[PDB]
Each structure stands twice: as C-alpha cells, then as structure tokens.
Design a binder for this molecule. Structure first.
Ligand SMILES: Cc1cc2nc3c(=O)[nH]c(=O)nc-3n(C[C@H](O)[C@H](O)[C@H](O)COP(=O)(O)OP(=O)(O)OC[C@H]3O[C@@H](n4cnc5c(N)ncnc54)[C@H](O)[C@@H]3O)c2cc1C
Ligand SMILES: NC(=O)c1nn(C[C@H](O)Cn2c3ccccc3c3ccccc32)c(=O)c2ccccc12
Length: 255
C-alpha cells in the first residue's frame, strides 16, 4: 500500500479510462507488471488488478487503461467523467483535485520474458493489449540506448478488436513504431473481428492462426519461438494446440 493520486485521465473510445497515477519515489516495476488498486471513493474495501500500460522509463507517473465492463470500473468511469465535466463548467480557481487511490504491487507476469527471447508472437484482444503496450514502449527506450544489449530479434504483434475506434487507445504508439522501426524488429497486425490511417493495412475477420503459426515457424526454425497471449480462453485453447503442433513456447494463463 502507498496512498497516492489519479492526477489526470483521458476518456477514450469504448468507455476506456487513460488514468495517470503519481508514481511513489520507491515504486520500481518492469514492463508486463500489474498492480492492485483501491479507490475509497468507489469502495473502501475492493482491490482490482490492472496492467501498468506505461513503461518504467516514464519517470513520475504510471498509466492504467481501464475499460468500464461492470460494477467497479463503471463507477470509476462515472466518477472520473463527472469530476471532469464539473471542471469544464467551473474548473478555474485551483487545479484538477485528484482522486485518492491505494496501489499494491508490482506483480509479475511471464510476458516480461519477451526481453530474453530471440523470437516472440504477442497476441491480444481488446484491452488485453495493455501489457504489450508497456513492453513495446520499453523496447523503443531500450533500442535508442542499447541496441546490442538486447537479444530480441523479431516481434510478431497481433491485436484483435470488435470495434475500430478501440485502435485509437494506442494508434500513436503504433505510428511511432512504424516511424522508428527502420531495422524491422516489428511486424504489426491489427484485425477487426490504412484503416487505422497507419502504413499497416487493418485486416478483417478472425485471423488464420494455423497459417500465421506455419509462417512464423518457417521464418525462425530451428530456433525457439515464444508465444505470449493476453485475451479470451476460447482463443487460448486454439493457440495452445498450435503451440504444440509447431513447437512454440506457451504459458498456461487462461483457465
Ligand atoms: C493481471 C490483470 C490485469 C488486468 N489488466 C487490465 C487492464 O489493463 N485493463 C482493464 O480494463 N482490465 C484489466 N483487467 C480486468 C480488471 O482487473 C477488473 O476486475 C474487471 O476487468 C472489472 O471489474 P468490475 O467490478 O468493473 O466488473 P464486474 O461487475 O466484475 O463484471 C465483470 C464481467 O463479468 C460479468 N459478470 C458480473 N457478474 C456476473 C454474474 N453474476 N454472472 C455472469 N457474468 C457476470 C459482467 O457482466 C462483466 O462482463 C485485468 C485483470 C488482471 C487479473
Ligand atoms: N498472468 C496474470 O497475472 C494473470 N493473468 N490472467 C489471465 C489474464 O491475462 C489477466 N487479464 C485479465 C483477466 C480477465 C479479464 C481481463 C483481463 C485482462 C485485461 C488486460 C490485461 C490483462 C488481463 C488472470 O486471469 C489472472 C488472474 C488473477 C491474477 C493474475 C492473472
């Protein structure tokens, strides 16, 4: 527990909160880490886990991207909306109040092992992108400072969304990767289930995972490929079968 503050927030399509949280002097994390958060204004007692969508190289704030999907996220959305509307109407004398919260973390995920892999597939659906958002930014910081120091040779990125407007959560970051990725570390793939106004053609329908895995296996054999997944369990079963078929690294993270 650290008592800290939501100092700012963005209201992004598909009811998502781009929260900025004052980072305590002590709080070190790695990309892929999550924390538990308590907002006394919503519940004195409930803790909910959220991925840190920021990279730890950002120095005074952490970011969380939280989608309104039920009771507690709905209430935090409504609280942040209303506080922000009240400021449009008044919002003058002092600066933005700041919502008090408690944070517990960081907690680790096997996704952090990407930095020690040669070849990685990152697959995410909807807000499932957030740990991969942290990791992509961190790769950009680590490259402008130490391209030799890193053994990650290729990153295959697959991000699925039911709703086109959801790509806006991280379209800037994806733009910057298209800009700065002269050495083609990344292969970005956006599926609606260019169109992002990116140099990446937004694809449509369920990806052909069999065909993608076959291709990635031909590119990297006989070396090890690590699959990292953040999304629904029905997809996980399919990905797990394919990981066995082509000899890829899988972590069971879906039950
Ligand atoms: C490591 C980790 C990282 C996460 N990172 C993020 C992140 O970066 N961003 C993010 O937005 N979320 C993230 N989540 C999800 C998040 O932690 C929240 O608890 C959850 O997403 C919302 O809680 P809630 O009270 O708002 O919703 P709830 O009210 O719990 O509802 C959740 C879902 O379950 C359904 N549901 C509720 N009650 C029932 C019932 N009785 N029967 C059937 N269905 C029901 C709801 O309809 C809804 O679809 C993460 C989770 C973990 C474990
Ligand atoms: N690997 C994890 O830390 C982790 N992973 N999973 C599978 C999920 O990947 C974690 N996770 C979710 C689990 C359920 C719903 C949304 C999410 C989610 C949204 C964005 C980023 C991560 C998300 C868990 O269910 C889980 C549950 C309790 C504690 C940790 C986890």
């Amino acid at each position: 527990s650290e008592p800290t503050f939501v100092v700012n927030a963005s209201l992004l399509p598909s009811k998502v909160l781009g929260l900025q949280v004052q980072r305590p002097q002590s709080f070190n994390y790695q990309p892929g880490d999550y924390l538990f958060i308590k907002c006394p204004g919503i519940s004195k007692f409930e803790w909910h886990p959220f991925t840190i969508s920021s990279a730890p190289e950002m120095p005074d704030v952490l970011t969380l991207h939280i989608r309104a999907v039920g009771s507690w996220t709905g209430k935090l959305y409504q609280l942040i909306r209303e506080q922000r509307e009240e400021w449009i109407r008044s919002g003058s004398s002092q600066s933005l109040p700041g919502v008090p919260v408690y944070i517990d973390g960081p907690y680790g995920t096997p996704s952090t092992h990407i930095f020690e892999s040669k070849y990685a597939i990152l697959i995410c659906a909807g807000i499932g992108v957030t740990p991969f958002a942290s990791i992509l930014k961190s790769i950009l910081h680590r490259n402008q400072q130490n391209p030799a120091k890193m053994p990650l040779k290729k990153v295959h990125f697959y991000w699925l969304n039911r709703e086109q407007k959801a790509f806006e959560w991280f379209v800037e970051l994806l733009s910057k990767i298209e800009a700065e990725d002269t050495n083609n570390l990344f292969d970005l793939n956006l599926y609606l289930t260019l169109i992002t106004g990116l140099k990446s053609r937004t694809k449509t329908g369920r990806p052909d995972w069999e065909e993608i895995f076959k291709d990635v296996a031909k590119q990297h054999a006989p070396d090890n490929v690590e699959v990292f997944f953040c999304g629904p369990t029905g997809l996980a079963l399919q990905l797990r079968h394919l990981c066995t078929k082509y000899g890829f690294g899988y972590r069971k993270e879906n039950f």
